Coordinates of C-alpha atoms (C1' of nucleotides) and ligand atoms in Angstrom, one line a residue:
Chain Q
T10 CA -140.3 47.8 -57.3
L11 CA -140.5 44.9 -55.1
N12 CA -138.8 46.8 -52.2
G13 CA -139.3 50.3 -53.6
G14 CA -140.7 52.1 -50.4
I15 CA -137.4 50.8 -48.7
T16 CA -135.0 51.7 -51.5
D17 CA -136.7 55.3 -52.2
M18 CA -136.0 56.0 -48.7
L19 CA -132.6 54.8 -48.7
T20 CA -131.9 56.8 -51.9
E21 CA -133.3 59.9 -50.3
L22 CA -131.2 59.3 -47.3
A23 CA -128.1 59.0 -49.5
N24 CA -128.9 62.3 -51.2
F25 CA -129.2 64.1 -48.0
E26 CA -125.8 63.0 -46.8
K27 CA -124.2 63.9 -50.1
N28 CA -126.0 67.4 -50.8
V29 CA -126.7 68.3 -47.3
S30 CA -124.4 66.7 -44.7
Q31 CA -121.4 66.7 -47.4
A32 CA -120.7 62.8 -45.9
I33 CA -119.8 61.0 -49.1
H34 CA -119.1 57.9 -47.4
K35 CA -122.4 57.8 -45.8
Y36 CA -123.9 58.5 -49.2
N37 CA -122.3 55.5 -50.6
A38 CA -123.2 53.5 -47.6
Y39 CA -127.1 54.3 -48.4
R40 CA -126.4 53.7 -52.1
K41 CA -125.1 50.6 -51.5
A42 CA -127.8 49.2 -49.0
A43 CA -130.4 50.7 -51.6
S44 CA -128.5 48.5 -54.3
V45 CA -128.3 45.5 -52.5
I46 CA -132.0 45.6 -51.4
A47 CA -133.2 46.4 -54.8
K48 CA -131.5 43.3 -56.0
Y49 CA -133.3 41.0 -53.4
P50 CA -135.8 38.8 -54.9
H51 CA -138.1 38.7 -51.8
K52 CA -140.3 41.5 -50.4
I53 CA -138.4 42.4 -47.0
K54 CA -140.7 41.7 -44.1
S55 CA -138.1 43.1 -41.4
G56 CA -134.8 45.0 -40.6
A57 CA -133.8 41.9 -39.4
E58 CA -134.1 40.2 -42.5
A59 CA -132.5 43.1 -44.2
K60 CA -129.4 43.4 -42.1
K61 CA -128.7 39.6 -43.6
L62 CA -127.6 41.4 -46.7
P63 CA -124.2 42.8 -46.9
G64 CA -124.2 46.4 -46.8
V65 CA -127.1 46.7 -44.5
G66 CA -126.2 47.0 -40.7
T67 CA -127.9 48.1 -37.5
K68 CA -128.9 51.5 -38.2
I69 CA -130.3 50.9 -41.8
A70 CA -132.2 47.9 -40.1
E71 CA -133.8 50.1 -37.5
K72 CA -134.9 52.5 -40.2
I73 CA -136.4 49.6 -42.3
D74 CA -138.5 48.3 -39.2
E75 CA -139.7 51.9 -38.7
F76 CA -140.8 52.2 -42.4
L77 CA -142.3 48.9 -42.3
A78 CA -144.2 49.8 -39.5
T79 CA -145.4 53.4 -40.3
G80 CA -144.9 53.6 -44.0
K81 CA -142.3 56.4 -43.5
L82 CA -139.3 57.8 -41.6
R83 CA -139.3 60.3 -39.2
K84 CA -135.9 61.6 -39.7
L85 CA -136.6 62.2 -43.6
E86 CA -140.2 63.7 -42.4
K87 CA -138.0 66.4 -40.4
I88 CA -135.4 66.6 -43.1
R89 CA -138.1 67.6 -45.8
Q90 CA -139.8 70.2 -43.4
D91 CA -136.1 71.8 -42.9
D92 CA -135.9 74.9 -45.5
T93 CA -132.1 75.1 -45.7
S94 CA -132.0 71.3 -46.5
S95 CA -134.7 71.7 -49.0
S96 CA -133.2 74.3 -51.0
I97 CA -129.7 72.8 -50.8
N98 CA -131.1 69.8 -52.4
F99 CA -133.0 71.2 -54.9
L100 CA -130.2 73.6 -56.2
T101 CA -127.8 70.5 -56.6
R102 CA -130.5 69.2 -59.3
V103 CA -128.9 71.7 -61.3
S104 CA -126.1 70.1 -63.4
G105 CA -123.1 72.2 -62.4
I106 CA -124.2 72.9 -58.9
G107 CA -122.9 70.7 -56.0
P108 CA -123.2 70.6 -52.5
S109 CA -120.6 73.5 -51.6
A110 CA -122.3 75.9 -54.6
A111 CA -125.8 74.8 -53.4
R112 CA -125.3 75.7 -49.8
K113 CA -122.9 79.0 -50.9
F114 CA -126.1 80.4 -53.3
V115 CA -128.6 79.6 -50.2
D116 CA -126.5 81.8 -48.2
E117 CA -126.6 84.4 -50.6
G118 CA -130.4 84.2 -50.8
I119 CA -130.5 82.3 -54.0
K120 CA -132.8 79.3 -53.0
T121 CA -135.2 78.9 -55.9
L122 CA -135.5 78.4 -59.6
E123 CA -136.7 81.9 -59.8
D124 CA -133.7 82.8 -57.8
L125 CA -131.5 81.2 -60.3
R126 CA -132.8 82.8 -63.3
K127 CA -132.7 86.2 -62.2
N128 CA -129.0 85.4 -61.0
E129 CA -127.4 83.9 -64.2
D130 CA -124.6 86.6 -63.7
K131 CA -123.6 84.5 -60.5
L132 CA -123.3 81.2 -62.4
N133 CA -120.3 79.6 -64.3
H134 CA -120.8 78.2 -68.0
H135 CA -122.0 74.8 -66.9
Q136 CA -124.3 75.8 -64.3
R137 CA -125.9 78.3 -66.8
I138 CA -126.6 75.5 -69.3
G139 CA -127.7 73.1 -66.3
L140 CA -130.4 76.0 -65.6
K141 CA -131.4 76.7 -69.3
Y142 CA -132.1 72.8 -69.7
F143 CA -133.3 72.3 -66.0
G144 CA -136.6 70.6 -67.0
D145 CA -135.1 68.8 -70.0
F146 CA -132.6 66.9 -68.0
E147 CA -134.7 65.6 -65.4
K148 CA -136.9 63.6 -68.4
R149 CA -136.0 60.1 -69.4
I150 CA -135.2 59.1 -72.7
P151 CA -137.2 56.3 -74.6
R152 CA -134.7 53.4 -75.9
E153 CA -136.7 54.4 -79.1
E154 CA -135.2 57.7 -79.2
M155 CA -131.8 56.1 -77.7
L156 CA -131.7 54.2 -81.2
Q157 CA -132.5 57.4 -83.1
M158 CA -129.4 59.3 -81.4
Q159 CA -127.1 56.3 -81.9
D160 CA -128.0 56.3 -85.5
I161 CA -127.0 60.0 -86.1
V162 CA -123.8 59.6 -83.9
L163 CA -122.4 56.4 -85.6
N164 CA -123.3 57.8 -89.2
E165 CA -121.8 61.2 -88.3
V166 CA -118.8 60.0 -86.9
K167 CA -118.3 57.9 -89.9
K168 CA -118.4 60.7 -92.3
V169 CA -115.7 62.3 -90.5
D170 CA -113.4 59.2 -90.4
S171 CA -114.6 55.6 -91.3
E172 CA -111.8 54.6 -88.8
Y173 CA -113.8 55.9 -85.9
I174 CA -115.4 53.4 -83.8
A175 CA -118.4 54.5 -81.7
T176 CA -120.0 52.7 -78.9
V177 CA -123.2 53.9 -76.8
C178 CA -122.4 52.5 -73.4
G179 CA -124.0 53.3 -70.0
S180 CA -127.8 51.9 -69.4
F181 CA -128.2 51.5 -72.8
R182 CA -125.6 48.9 -73.2
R183 CA -126.9 47.2 -70.4
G184 CA -130.2 46.9 -72.3
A185 CA -132.4 49.8 -70.3
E186 CA -135.8 50.7 -71.6
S187 CA -134.9 54.3 -70.8
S188 CA -131.9 56.4 -70.3
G189 CA -131.0 59.2 -68.1
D190 CA -128.7 60.5 -70.9
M191 CA -126.2 59.3 -73.8
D192 CA -122.9 57.8 -73.3
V193 CA -120.5 57.4 -76.4
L194 CA -117.2 55.6 -76.1
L195 CA -115.0 56.7 -79.1
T196 CA -111.8 55.1 -80.4
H197 CA -109.7 56.0 -83.4
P198 CA -106.5 53.8 -84.7
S199 CA -104.5 57.0 -84.5
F200 CA -104.7 57.4 -80.5
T201 CA -103.3 54.6 -78.6
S202 CA -101.5 54.2 -75.2
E203 CA -98.6 54.4 -77.3
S204 CA -99.0 57.4 -79.2
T205 CA -101.4 60.4 -80.5
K206 CA -100.8 60.5 -84.2
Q207 CA -103.3 63.0 -85.0
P208 CA -104.6 66.0 -82.8
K209 CA -108.1 67.3 -82.5
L210 CA -109.7 63.7 -82.7
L211 CA -112.5 64.6 -80.2
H212 CA -112.6 68.0 -81.7
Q213 CA -113.7 66.9 -85.2
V214 CA -116.5 64.7 -84.0
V215 CA -117.7 67.4 -81.6
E216 CA -117.6 70.0 -84.6
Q217 CA -119.4 67.5 -87.0
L218 CA -122.3 66.9 -84.5
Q219 CA -122.7 70.8 -84.0
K220 CA -122.7 71.1 -87.6
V221 CA -125.8 68.9 -88.1
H222 CA -127.2 70.5 -85.2
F223 CA -127.3 67.4 -83.0
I224 CA -124.9 68.9 -80.2
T225 CA -126.4 72.1 -79.2
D226 CA -124.3 72.9 -76.3
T227 CA -121.0 72.2 -74.3
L228 CA -120.5 72.2 -70.5
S229 CA -116.8 71.2 -70.6
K230 CA -114.7 70.0 -73.4
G231 CA -110.9 68.4 -73.1
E232 CA -108.8 66.2 -75.3
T233 CA -110.7 63.1 -74.3
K234 CA -113.7 64.0 -72.8
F235 CA -116.7 66.0 -74.0
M236 CA -119.7 66.8 -71.9
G237 CA -122.7 68.4 -73.3
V238 CA -125.9 68.8 -75.2
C239 CA -127.8 67.2 -78.0
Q240 CA -131.3 67.0 -79.5
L241 CA -132.9 64.7 -82.1
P242 CA -134.3 66.7 -85.2
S243 CA -138.0 67.0 -85.3
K244 CA -140.2 66.8 -88.5
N245 CA -142.5 69.6 -89.9
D246 CA -145.2 70.9 -87.5
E247 CA -144.2 68.4 -84.6
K248 CA -143.1 69.6 -81.3
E249 CA -139.2 69.3 -81.0
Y250 CA -137.6 66.9 -78.5
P251 CA -136.3 67.6 -75.3
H252 CA -132.5 68.5 -75.4
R253 CA -130.3 65.6 -73.7
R254 CA -127.0 65.0 -71.9
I255 CA -124.4 63.9 -73.9
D256 CA -121.0 62.5 -72.8
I257 CA -118.4 61.3 -75.4
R258 CA -115.0 60.0 -74.0
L259 CA -111.9 59.2 -76.3
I260 CA -110.3 56.4 -75.1
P261 CA -107.0 54.7 -76.7
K262 CA -107.7 52.4 -79.2
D263 CA -105.7 49.2 -77.4
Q264 CA -107.5 50.0 -73.9
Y265 CA -111.0 49.5 -75.5
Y266 CA -112.2 46.7 -73.3
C267 CA -111.4 48.6 -69.8
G268 CA -112.9 51.7 -71.5
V269 CA -116.2 49.9 -72.3
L270 CA -116.1 48.2 -68.9
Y271 CA -115.9 51.5 -67.3
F272 CA -118.4 53.3 -69.4
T273 CA -120.9 50.3 -69.4
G274 CA -121.2 50.7 -65.6
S275 CA -123.1 51.0 -63.5
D276 CA -121.4 53.1 -61.3
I277 CA -122.2 51.1 -58.3
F278 CA -121.1 48.1 -60.3
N279 CA -117.8 49.6 -61.3
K280 CA -117.1 50.6 -57.4
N281 CA -118.2 47.2 -56.4
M282 CA -115.9 45.8 -59.1
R283 CA -113.0 48.0 -58.6
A284 CA -113.3 47.5 -54.5
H285 CA -113.2 43.7 -55.3
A286 CA -110.1 43.9 -57.7
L287 CA -108.2 45.5 -54.8
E288 CA -109.0 42.9 -52.2
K289 CA -107.7 40.4 -55.2
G290 CA -104.6 42.4 -55.4
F291 CA -105.6 44.2 -58.6
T292 CA -106.3 48.1 -59.5
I293 CA -108.7 48.8 -62.3
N294 CA -109.4 52.1 -64.0
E295 CA -110.7 52.9 -67.7
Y296 CA -107.6 52.2 -69.2
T297 CA -106.1 49.1 -67.6
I298 CA -105.8 46.5 -64.7
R299 CA -102.6 46.4 -63.1
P300 CA -101.2 44.1 -60.1
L301 CA -100.6 45.9 -56.8
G302 CA -97.0 45.4 -55.9
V303 CA -96.0 44.1 -52.3
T304 CA -96.1 47.8 -51.1
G305 CA -99.3 48.6 -52.7
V306 CA -97.8 50.4 -55.6
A307 CA -99.5 49.5 -59.2
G308 CA -97.5 47.6 -61.5
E309 CA -97.5 47.3 -65.3
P310 CA -100.6 46.8 -67.3
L311 CA -101.8 43.2 -67.9
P312 CA -102.6 41.9 -71.2
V313 CA -106.4 42.2 -71.9
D314 CA -108.3 41.0 -75.1
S315 CA -111.7 41.1 -73.7
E316 CA -114.2 42.5 -71.0
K317 CA -114.0 38.8 -69.7
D318 CA -110.3 38.8 -69.5
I319 CA -110.7 41.6 -66.8
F320 CA -113.4 39.5 -64.9
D321 CA -111.0 36.3 -64.8
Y322 CA -108.1 38.3 -63.2
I323 CA -110.4 39.3 -60.2
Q324 CA -111.8 35.6 -60.1
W325 CA -115.4 36.5 -61.1
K326 CA -117.6 35.1 -63.4
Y327 CA -118.5 37.0 -66.4
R328 CA -121.5 39.3 -65.8
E329 CA -123.4 40.6 -69.3
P330 CA -123.7 44.2 -69.5
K331 CA -127.5 43.7 -68.9
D332 CA -126.6 42.1 -65.4
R333 CA -124.4 45.0 -64.3
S334 CA -127.2 47.4 -63.2
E335 CA -126.4 48.0 -59.6
Chain K
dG1 C1' -123.1 53.9 -42.1
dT2 C1' -120.8 49.2 -42.8
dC3 C1' -117.4 46.3 -43.0
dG4 C1' -113.2 43.0 -42.1
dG5 C1' -109.1 41.8 -39.7
Chain M
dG1 C1' -97.9 81.5 -66.9
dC2 C1' -97.3 76.7 -64.1
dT3 C1' -98.5 73.4 -60.3
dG4 C1' -101.6 71.8 -56.7
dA5 C1' -105.9 71.5 -54.7
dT6 C1' -110.8 71.6 -54.9
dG7 C1' -115.5 71.2 -57.0
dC8 C1' -118.3 68.5 -59.9
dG9 C1' -119.3 64.8 -62.7
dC10 C1' -119.1 60.6 -65.4
Chain P
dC1 C1' -111.8 48.9 -32.3
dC2 C1' -110.5 51.7 -36.6
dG3 C1' -109.7 52.7 -41.0
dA4 C1' -110.9 52.2 -45.5
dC5 C1' -114.7 53.2 -48.5
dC6 C1' -113.0 53.5 -57.2
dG7 C1' -110.6 56.3 -60.1
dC8 C1' -110.1 59.9 -63.0
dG9 C1' -111.1 64.4 -66.8
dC10 C1' -112.3 69.1 -66.9
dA11 C1' -113.0 73.9 -64.7
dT12 C1' -111.7 76.9 -61.3
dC13 C1' -109.0 78.7 -58.2
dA14 C1' -104.7 80.0 -54.8
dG15 C1' -100.2 80.7 -54.6
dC16 C1' -96.1 81.5 -56.7
Ligands
LIG401 N1 -115.8 54.0 -61.9 C1 -116.7 54.9 -62.0 N2 -117.7 54.8 -63.2 C2 -118.7 55.6 -63.0 C3 -119.0 56.7 -62.2 N3 -120.1 57.3 -62.5 C4 -120.3 57.0 -63.7 N4 -119.7 55.9 -63.8 C5 -119.7 55.0 -65.5 C6 -120.4 54.0 -65.3 C7 -121.7 54.5 -65.9 O1 -122.6 53.6 -66.6 C8 -121.4 55.6 -67.0 C9 -121.9 56.6 -67.5 O2 -122.4 57.6 -66.3 P1 -124.1 57.6 -66.1 O3 -124.6 58.0 -67.5 O4 -124.0 58.7 -65.0 O5 -124.6 56.4 -65.7 P2 -125.5 55.5 -66.4 O6 -125.3 54.2 -66.1 O7 -125.6 55.8 -67.8 C10 -127.2 56.0 -65.6 CL1 -128.4 54.6 -65.4 CL2 -127.2 56.8 -64.4 P3 -128.4 56.9 -66.9 O8 -129.0 56.1 -67.9 O9 -129.6 57.4 -66.1 O10 -127.4 58.1 -67.7 O11 -120.1 56.1 -66.5 C11 -118.3 56.7 -60.7 O12 -118.5 57.1 -59.6 N5 -117.0 55.8 -61.1
LIG402 CL1 -119.0 60.4 -44.7
LIG403 CL1 -103.4 53.3 -66.5
LIG404 MG1 -125.6 57.5 -68.8

DNA sequence: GTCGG
DNA sequence: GCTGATGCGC
DNA sequence: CCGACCGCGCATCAGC
């Protein structure tokens, strides 16, 4: 919050490029600049001071001087006044509605929450659930509640098969005092990169959590990735908790470390780290880290026995989860 | 929009 | 039906 | 300059 004004402005600009302009690289440039600045231990005094940081260039420098001078940015001022842009940005806030669908909805005269509700027929499954819990998904999750959720998930999974290992990742594993949702990494000895000895490994867990009424809805579901909704049980007479977004990712047991690295994030941390790996001649995904051949083709997976091993391969000093929040 | 070669 | 591209999300 | 910008699972569609 030291440079909150500036980072907020950059994020708004990032969201505009992504949602309205559909310019992903500009979106990421703004996000990176915001990220690099939010980590800066000094209260920025000029765009010049900011341009010193990698990720901030001439354009963002100028915008920072304007913001520092007036306390706002005219470019954004005009974007907020723009109806089409305003409507498109709003609609993308519904899970399942992206830049394309939002712009398409606006063309059809569907621009508001009221319009969406009276046009459910025009939404796919994911979008319907997104609209259903629109308000709830905007809410933050206190770490206290994350702990209760963790307890339920780990205990329910244990009941299905004592061999399952569920790990809560995302901002929770990074030590955040609140999270936007729950991310669960799941492993089972029967599912490795070498073979899938038992089917429905993910399904069984999903089924068990729906059975005890923890999982309430599904946005999408496959062999290794579940994307849905959950809710903590409330006591008698007490208002019920808000519904929460939950993702469960089944990863090969022998590829746990690359999996937990990926799922722990942050997303920008992953991007920076993956980009650095490339520069160092390696490629990283949630399954492995492989070297890049002379022509640029990925090679065979390298042995990994801890998250640190991955960091060493790319010549990075180990960074604890709590320090990966970029 | 920013960056490295 | 399958394969490939695209949207969307993590 | 100028092109590279992380990598991938699921849902949906187009074309066959
Ligand atoms: N490589 C890669 N990994 C990603 C990406 N997006 C997400 N991940 C990985 C890294 C992410 O940590 C993880 C979970 O996705 P979230 O739940 O979206 O991210 P959280 O960090 O949990 C959070 Cl702070 Cl947005 P919140 O607490 O509010 O949920 O997935 C991406 O674009 N790329
Ligand atoms: Cl772009
Ligand atoms: Cl792989
Ligand atoms: Mg999360």
